[PDB]
Chain A
Amino acid sequence: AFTVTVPKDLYVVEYGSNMTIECKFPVEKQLDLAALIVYWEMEDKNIIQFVHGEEDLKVQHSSYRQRARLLKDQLSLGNAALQITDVKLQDAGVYRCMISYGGADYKRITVKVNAPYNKINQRILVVDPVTSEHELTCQAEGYPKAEVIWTSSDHQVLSGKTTTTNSKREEKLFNVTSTLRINTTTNEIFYCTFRRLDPEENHTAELVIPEL
């Protein structure tokens, strides 16, 4: 008869990314759009209500207007693909999909959102061109809190200061900023590592001293 298949019960998603969680169901040659109902939901928030070949917007929860969308073209392949744009921490939880086509069935999907320190912004300035002292800076946004380990091109630890605040563009993301002020010359390579826990993630940017 009718069964709903989940290719993967768990989706691990990175922050600020797209996501396409998929629910499958049997289809025969063509589709009967009239007899199909697709419904997505998470924590009893209505996300998708697809009836009679068109999504029912009036029911869709407000916090998903313009970020949730079902892909019609996939339905002809027996795939109810829910797509969310710019994934946030608030999108983590348990998602339910309920499909009605002839018979019916529902399935659950879990979503966990990484908040990694992928994007690292670096700035190199010249404190005193006489002593050739520079000011190296690294900053990134992630969760949970992280520390910065300044290592040379010779894999040796240098000391810096780490200021750790909360994000403004987003809610609880920690903004970690570290600064190096070391006398150095042109073409010298340095590294700033972003070590955070839960789980152990190391992310390192490379800063090369320019000339003049």
Chain B
Amino acid sequence: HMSTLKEVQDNITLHEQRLVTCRKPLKEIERAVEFVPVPVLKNILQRERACVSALETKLGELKRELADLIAAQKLAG
């Protein structure tokens, strides 16, 4: 049982490691350029929002698994 919790817990950390990598492309522009053109800004946030909403959907389905496995080990013990 305890390895199944361990396999999901370090899969949610990976995805929270994936969520941070989605705003990464913008931060690497503010690092390098001092004036961001509006069309180039206007599109990047839309990709950064297309991922983050998609990645936040995934975390819902993973954080729900742990609660199910926590409930299972409460019926058992």
A interface list, Cβ under 8 A from B: 34-37, 39, 41, 46, 49, 51-52, 58-59, 98, 100, 102-104, 106
In the complex, A46 Cα to B37 Cα: how many Å? 13
User: Quick one: closest B residue to A104, CB to CB?
Assistant: B35
A104 proximity list for chain B (CB < 8 A): 35, 37
Task: Sample 30 A-B pairs with CB under 8 A, ordered by A number.
Answer: A34-B32, A35-B32, A35-B33, A35-B34, A36-B33, A37-B29, A37-B33, A37-B37, A37-B40, A39-B39, A41-B39, A49-B40, A49-B43, A51-B29, A52-B28, A52-B29, A52-B32, A58-B47, A98-B39, A98-B40, A100-B33, A100-B34, A100-B35, A100-B36, A100-B37, A102-B34, A103-B35, A104-B35, A104-B37, A106-B37
Distance in angstroms from A205 CB to nearest chain B CB is 47
In the complex, A49 Cα to B32 Cα: how many Å? 15
In chain B, positions 10-42 with a C-beta closer than 8 Å to chain A are: 28-29, 32-37, 39-40
In the complex, A37 Cα to B37 Cα: how many Å? 8
B43 proximity list for chain A (CB < 8 A): 46, 49, 59
In the complex, A37 Cα to B31 Cα: how many Å? 13
In the complex, A100 Cα to B34 Cα: how many Å? 8
In chain B, positions 23-77 with a C-beta closer than 8 Å to chain A are: 28-29, 32-37, 39-40, 43, 47
Given contacts A34-B32, A98-B40, 6 further A-B contacts (CB under 8 A): A39-B40, A49-B43, A59-B43, A100-B35, A104-B35, A104-B37
A98 near B32 with CB under 8 A, answer no
Distance in angstroms from B44 CB to nearest chain A CB is 8
B28 proximity list for chain A (CB < 8 A): 52
User: Quick one: closest B residue to A58, CB to CB?
Assistant: B47
In the complex, A157 Cα to B35 Cα: how many Å? 65
In the complex, A102 Cα to B32 Cα: how many Å? 10
In the complex, A104 Cα to B29 Cα: how many Å? 15
A102 proximity list for chain B (CB < 8 A): 34
B33 proximity list for chain A (CB < 8 A): 35-37, 100
Distance in angstroms from B29 CB to nearest chain A CB is 7
In the complex, A106 Cα to B32 Cα: how many Å? 19
B34 proximity list for chain A (CB < 8 A): 35, 100, 102
Distance in angstroms from B43 CB to nearest chain A CB is 5
Q: A46-B43, A51-B29, A59-B43 are in contact. Are A39 and B37 (CB under 8 A)?
A: yes
User: Quick one: closest A residue to B34, CB to CB?
Assistant: A102
In the complex, A41 Cα to B36 Cα: how many Å? 16
B47 proximity list for chain A (CB < 8 A): 58-59
Q: A51-B29, A52-B28, A59-B43 are in contact. Are A98 and B35 (CB under 8 A)?
A: no
Distance in angstroms from A27 CB to nearest chain B CB is 15
In the complex, A37 Cα to B43 Cα: how many Å? 14
